[PDB]
């Protein structure tokens, strides 16, 4: 599970992150890359690649910041995964949360349902393995940090999720 595209499959560089997430995690933070969007597996590999390159080469980070990335292709791409503390929501939220990030800018476009489906299924396949709590709370990026992420349109949608909390 759960049709997660593994690091090696999207041509990732080697993670160098050591700091580990205490399971089971209470919080999920939903962001956007505010990068280029992609609707094929081929373009979404290329794009996940591009995100990690910025984070690693330019920002000198130990890996891509997000635990997981959602493509409009409808597949989840493995970032730091369930166990490795992210860099997506800053110091107060990074240690106590999983960050998933929709690849693209969602101010003036919604993600297609398969992307929204992928995410929800990703979230379920996280309780199952005990990475997430049963009663996990979903926060928007803007709900924990000064940012427009995850975009006006995607933010509206996640407010309607059963697990969402302001």
Stretch of 3-11, 55-63, 88-96, 127-135 contacting Cl ion, by CB under 5 A? 55-63
62 binds, options Cl ion, its own copies, none, Cβ within 5 to 8 A by partner type: Cl ion
Instruction: Label residues 74-93 b or e (16+ Cβ within 10 Å = b).
Output: bbbbbbbbbebbbbbbeeeb
Q: Which does 36 bind (CB under 5 to 8 A by kind): its own copies, Cl ion, none?
A: none
Q: Are 53 and 60 in contact (CB under 8 A)?
A: no
CB nearer to Cl ion: give 60 or 113.
Answer: 60
Sole binder of Cl ion in the list 35, 43, 61, 96 (CB under 5 A): 61
Of 91, 101, 85, residue with least CA distance to 30: 101
List alpha helices for 25-158, DSSP H.
41-53, 113-127, 152-158
Task: Tell me which of 13, 62, 107, 148 binds Cl ion, using CB under 5 A.
Answer: 62
Find which of its own copies, Cl ion, none residue 90 binds, CB within 5 to 8 Å per kind. none
**At closest approach, how far in Å is the CB of 121 from its own copies?**
4
We find the least distance from the C-beta atom of residue 124 to its own copies, in angstroms, to be: 6
Asked if residues 70 and 120 have their Cβ atoms less than 8 Å apart, the reply is: no
């Amino acid at each position: 599970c759960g049709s997660i595209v593994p690091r090696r499959e999207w041509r990732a560089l080697a993670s160098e992150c050591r700091e580990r997430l205490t399971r089971p995690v209470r919080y999920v933070v939903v962001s956007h890359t505010a990068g280029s969007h992609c609707d094929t597996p081929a373009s979404c590999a290329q794009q996940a690649q591009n995100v990690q390159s910025y984070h690693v080469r330019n920002l000198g980070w130990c890996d891509v910041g997000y635990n997981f990335l959602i493509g409009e292709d409808g597949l989840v791409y493995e970032g730091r995964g369930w166990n490795i503390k992210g860099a997506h929501a800053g110091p107060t939220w990074n240690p106590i949360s999983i960050g998933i990030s929709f690849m693209g800018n969602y101010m003036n476009r919604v993600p297609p349902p398969r992307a929204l489906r992928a995410a929800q299924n990703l979230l379920a396949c996280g309780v199952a393995l005990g990475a997430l709590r049963s009663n996990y709370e979903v926060k928007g990026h803007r709900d924990v940090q000064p940012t427009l992420s995850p975009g006006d349109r995607l933010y509206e949608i996640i407010q309607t999720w059963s697990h969402y909390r302001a």
